Symmetry: D2
Subunit: 239 residues, 4 copies
């Protein structure tokens, strides 16, 4: 029965950057579908923890700067100790820096790239090693952007990193499919979080809009989807 | 709770070409998710009917050449009687003709384009009107292809039609989002069906999944795109291809 | 010497739909680069002929409905008889029909598809047969749209046909590239051929027929020999935004 | 008269990585079209200098590590001092590192990203500042890849960087097109240069790729001369933010 394919009962999902907005939405969405949650945040995710534990699921709350790639192995070791396994990774921790391209600083380049693409690759690598050891496959969900498709303005490192996310998602699928690993991405549109007439849906997107697609991509219901980016954008890219 | 968003209890789904292969899979998947099915076919979908009814769901079997666009209005009327509404449409009925591009006949062009794109737009329109009348939105799922993205060989009208499907999917979402209608597409990879019956091994080694797709692989994605779980996805094509486009 | 690679002296270009605007621009640009021109139009391209012949180039004006695919072999035979060979095809003849998608007529579907994609495929087939006979390769330039990439509104058959153009361009390259035939497309942006739209064009101006002269000469020349199956946007940055 | 639009007489082009292969091809093509050339290389590009000067054009040879973004301004200042202006930038300097993704080292990440995307953005920024000062527009040509479109294997930082090139090309156009600056990219297909040397030595793999190139041949440096001149010229003035594949039909197949 196909509805069972969406059910994430007994699954363990590690979501970086889930204290608020989109990442919170996705963490709560995965918990609602049955996942226990490991969070990695720089801010304590109390509201998320309350909402996750209120569903009767567990939340392991890890505090770390995701840009420190040497730190990743331990984060995943702790998750594995606490739950026995890690099944799903959502690489949502990210930042944006706005400055005219002609003035753009090296700091505003490095900080964004270090988090939005470099740490995404290395965290995916770290978790994939654990998936392989487990031998039962795994799911990775990266977070792309409309700026994976279009250039935008004043955010060169964000556009670069998000375009890179879409590309590296393809490579990870190509290389790791043999390990039973799916790697896909969600590209949110313009979301009401920390233009409107160009959205066919006529509304801003919300964290709630990412719950369904994230459960879908985290579940057996999307097993033959791999290396692909799915726009959750109210039709932005269509117009 | 989010798992309730995938539940299609009480919905009616019209699927074209569901007697076999991919369409059969989507019809059955939609039925398992709670849908009553309306089939439109050239041959009786006997197996599909038995599997849909075995789940305690209803199946209306309509028979028609989908390429006849004047006959679409009636098919939707027949559905609205009996079931009372139509909430979901899957435009899966299609064909392919293989012939060297330099020799390609007008017949092999028209036959493919009439079904694969023309009939798809006009059926979507017909069902869209019904959606608007009903006033509670709706879902359309078109079927794209790897040949919406890549050219292939010896199938100019197929590549043309499937590329056109990806594009009209965008327009229909743009124009009809205001009516609460989501129009998306699934692009299957290389699937084991009648459509694809050592050349095989070269392709297979370029599918990261390492296996042909199956009708079962479209059940999850089709239920997803037919449900509230995908409400902010519109005008978009999702590849279900085992990583083909990634390689 | 690379500038020689852009020189189209001795070449013959068949352009459909070149009486005005973009098609006229492309025919003139090709003529400026050295091409003699064969036009196919519904009416005499009088102004285009004047401009081409003023450059010292030949113009053969054929009058026909490009949507009649049974007529193509004759059009190509006439071009080959007049000049001895045909080297370049530009499939510009096209139309658009605007009408709400929910009300869209079958006539406004058929009319647009017959010309914008069906005739494009069959004209390309017709000319490709001639290219293969000649044995010196050839060039096909199809005309795509921003609506090959985006949906638009009120023009279902236009979007269908132009999305199809981008796809069939890929397939024709796949099959014919081995013969030295290059099949590519130009996707013009918003051309002068309101403020809301300009503010989303990075270049901050409408495109002009002259903006297609360089790209069409490039894709018709030796300078683009390893480009095949590809659509090039000439859009002032529209798709980037 | 349109052929004049391709003529780069009086123009000055700065090409990074033009000692060999693709970059050398583009430098020579630009020089054949009339450009004086500024090279930025790790060693003196003797062959390229020979060929460019034989055409009657000037070659300013700069030796520098393009990954050092602090040194870019000085490179451009030298160019401007020599010729009075810089009109065209080709961001060709790049590397690739092959290693299983599951094992991929931090070094193989950083070295590739630093050159292939970071330095590309900052060199573009440096030259764009000069274009704005001059007030006569300018051309930037970035170098994408088939791996801007497809994933590949064993080269995560390459795929990341080249996908990022396609994206930043869009943004740079968005911001700078108003100044008559055109930022575009060329995506070479499978070209017979050092980067495909190992691949081409494997007879079996070589044929599997070649059989999937519709043109039925590998690309060569000469195949980028025309497209680079085009993108560096007034003939492409309404093309902006776009990546053009020079791939013999690879992406079409
Ligand atoms: N590898 C693949 O199988 C693949 C890949 C991409 C897209 N597709 C598309 O998926 C769809 C399903 O094809 P398939 O793979 O199951 O093989 P298929 O040929 O068995 O499916 C075609 C379906 O359409 C029906 N049909 C044909 N002509 C019709 C007509 N005139 N009116 C009504 N119904 C008609 C057939 O009876 C059948 O049920 C098609 O649109 C196909 O082009 C398939």
């Amino acid at each position: 029965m196909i509805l069972n394919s969406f059910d994430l009962q007994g699954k363990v999902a590690l979501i970086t950057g889930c204290d608020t907005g989109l990442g919170q939405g996705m963490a709560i969405g995965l918990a609602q579908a049955g996942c226990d949650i490991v969070g990695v945040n720089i801010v304590e995710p109390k509201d998320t923890i309350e909402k996750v534990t209120a569903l009767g699921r567990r939340f392991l709350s890890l505090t770390a700067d995701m840009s420190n790639v040497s730190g990743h192995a331990e984060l995943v070791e702790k998750a594995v100790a606490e739950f026995g396994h890690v099944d799903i990774l959502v690489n949502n921790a990210g930042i944006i820096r706005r400055e005219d391209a002609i003035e753009f600083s090296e700091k505003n380049w490095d900080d964004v790239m270090n988090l939005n693409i470099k740490s995404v690759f290395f965290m995916s690598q770290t978790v994939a090693r654990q998936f392989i050891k487990q031998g039962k496959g795994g799911k990775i969900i990266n977070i792309a952007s409309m700026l994976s498709f279009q250039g935008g303005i004043r955010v060169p490192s964000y556009t670069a990193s998000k375009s890179a996310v879409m590309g590296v998602t393809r490579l990870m699928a190509n290389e790791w499919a043999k390990h039973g690993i799916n790697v896909n991405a969600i590209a949110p549109g313009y979301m009401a979080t920390n233009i409107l007439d160009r959205i066919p849906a006529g509304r801003w997107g919300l964290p709630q809009d990412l719950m369904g697609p994230s459960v879908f991509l985290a579940s057996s219901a999307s097993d033959y989807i791999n290396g692909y980016t799915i726009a959750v954008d109210g039709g932005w890219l269509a117009r």
